[PDB]
Assembly symmetry: C4
Homo-oligomer: 243 residues x 4
């Protein structure tokens, strides 16, 4: 169907070669994407992904971002795996009743049986965990996307200063090989096409560069924007304490 740009928040996010920006695409963002100092991929997101550990606060924050007209998103995804050691069980069980307009990412991730098996085996037995950038690719493939453009994936710093007060108060495997091997498995297994939008990223050594279309893109500035996660009230945490 339509193309999709999947963006991690690595430093390459600020080094996209926009001449290679595809025509007609959706955008997937994750975690502290809003910390970006400019709208490197626009204000419109098809989907935003948040880890279960901070979903409570990210959801709260997202609503503010939307009200402030800083961003808009069609879908709100929680990057879960249905694994007791990775996320809170009751959180997943009651998810749809606390966040009626959001989705459990596993609902889609699990549609890719071969990859789910691949991910689980390496995480359970070898402690290898893929990053959100790869999780988003899986969900995109599950949703039907055929051409995936990657950016902000640098296998580890960020494309912004993530050292924020509120975030620090909340959160004071991986490896390049795991992510790369996972991406190759996805591309091969589901016959989709991966492209790299960041020619200077280490990712460009493994994934084909997005074709040059002589495209152009206006990177809108951001001023007095939300650059830190918000913390809900004490009464709010009390009500959500069990999750």
């Amino acid at each position: 169907m339509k193309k999709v740009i999947i963006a991690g928040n690595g430093p390459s996010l600020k080094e996209i070669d926009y001449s290679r920006l595809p025509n007609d695409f959706d955008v997937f963002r994750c975690n502290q994407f809003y910390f970006e100092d400019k709208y490197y991929l626009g204000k419109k997101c098809k989907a935003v992904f948040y880890n279960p550990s901070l979903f409570f606060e990210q959801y709260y924050t997202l609503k503010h971002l939307i009200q402030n007209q800083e961003y808009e998103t069609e879908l709100i995804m929680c990057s879960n795996y249905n694994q007791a050691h990775l996320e809170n069980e009751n959180f997943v069980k009651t998810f749809y009743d606390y966040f009626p307009d959001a989705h459990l990412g596993y609902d889609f991730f699990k549609q890719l049986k071969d990859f789910n098996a691949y991910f689980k085996f390496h995480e359970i037995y070898f402690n290898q965990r893929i990053t959100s950038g790869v999780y988003m690719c899986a969900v995109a493939i599950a949703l039907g996307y055929k051409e995936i453009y990657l950016s902000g994936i640098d296998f580890y710093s960020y494309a912004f200063d993530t050292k924020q007060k509120n975030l620090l108060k909340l959160a004071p495997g991986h490896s390049k090989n795991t992510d790369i091997k996972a991406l190759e498995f996805l591309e091969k297994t589901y016959k989709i096409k991966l492209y790299c939008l960041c020619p200077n990223s280490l990712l460009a050594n493994f994934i084909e560069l997005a074709p040059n279309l002589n495209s152009n893109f206006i990177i809108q500035e951001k001023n007095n924007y939300t650059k830190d996660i918000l913390i809900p009230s004490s009464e709010a945490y009390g009500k959500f304490s069990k999750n």
Copy 2:
């Protein structure tokens, strides 16, 4: 889908301009509606709503109201939200096995995804909660109703006032907050309900009306079109004016659900 009169129990319930009373309509009542001293809206209810906290006792009381021919109702709704801080999990889980002829209001409330998201966000993060008067509007919409006539909704302007004396022995024993000068729940507000009502009307394209011209609600919702009709309020004598409390053995059997 007939029209529907949704009634809270505020003092405006006793001041309905019956000249605006629609023709063919259903009636939704809630909580201590039977405390009314006159059948301000007739004996026949399409549905009655009860909060999870007192559902056990309200169900018991309802069966007595029906057996005693004081009221009749087609549906019995429990106003739940699938929120751990608002209701007992087991109660909801086993609901249909303990009350086979009743319904969990959430089964319908959740059909309105946007409103459920709206409600949950404000309740969880800002402690802003709609009242059952608004909850019933949502369930009516989910049921298919498109013309809602409101009454008995006064946003607790004069405090915890009602269209009757709610300070009854059993109710005070079961819900002690009623003994307070102002039993109104801090999370409720005139604005919250109004905005919630505005959200529903807009989002689901339904029409709202007000049967109480003298009510504070008349300042927000369009008054019902004076159809120049009559109703005739039936009087009530030696009626059930307090909630009933089940036996100790009954509570024992239900203990896991409370």
Copy 3:
């Protein structure tokens, strides 16, 4: 639907006016039905009902009744209600995996919404309980039966071992009355000398004949499973 005869194990079971016994019918029996000294209703059962409290042992016993050619039954029902104070929670939860060829009676009982509500309200709030005869009537109606003929309803070291201390007339009667008033079914009484005859219309005399086969070397007490078996099912008792 074929006609169904629902039998309790009261003395009226031995006083059935066979002249009224229908032609093509199914038979529902419950609990210690096999204690009967004669096949008052034949060896063939459409279904047998057992209370959750002794299901473990009754199932074990039934398998012997079947293998030993004493009785046969198509269905095996456990008379549950999905009430924590009435049945073991884990027992109901895992029922179909421990007894693959049996059924939870509630799966059918719950199909009668009005009666389920009627039963639940009176039991929970007033401690009024129905007997198996009434429960079986409900299940029969839920299964699609149109005509129900009642009998055996008059309001062993092992059994005494399992049940040491081994309901009301009004409650059952009121329940049956509600059942007939609420659903599209006809109720008949096959025992004219039973008190039930004072409330339920007598089955029409059809000048029917029926040979009552005697029983010999039959199982007349419930069987008790091994301690190892009990060890495996202890969580459900």
Copy 4:
């Protein structure tokens, strides 16, 4: 499907009469089948079956067998029965989320209502258990196979000995097999004319078939043990 060869890992596994091998068949293997010193039935399995008790370790080991190309399998089955005294409950509950490409054998076993009831009654009340050979037969029948060829069924490694240093019997297994065959109208054949099984099951027809028994060199001959970190993650299911 069509035809399937079900194999236990007894001595008869090494005494198959390949002249009687069907032409188009799938292979079902169980537990320590890889301990075989030769590929008596090929490297390709339609399905492999592991008991719940060691599934965690067997799954880990199978992935190595596959990665090292010693064997390949389409299906991975856990031989469960939905019985607390026979398997961990949380293990069964979360199974598909920990092993996305595997299957709970009971999802198929329970499709044979009569046999499920038959098995449960005798296991619960008479402590009679069936061996994997029989379990695989039931699953095979549930999957649609009509002709089942048995082998490696004879009624009778540091890692395995450390991990696992009853109620089985020829009678129970044989009676169970006969019940399955009669009840589900399928045909059972014995591929090992020198096994006691031959005394009960009709030998497979001689079709003058040929089979190449591939050798095994430097192969996995013991179960593998996951890391302590892995165990810590699966602890609740063991």
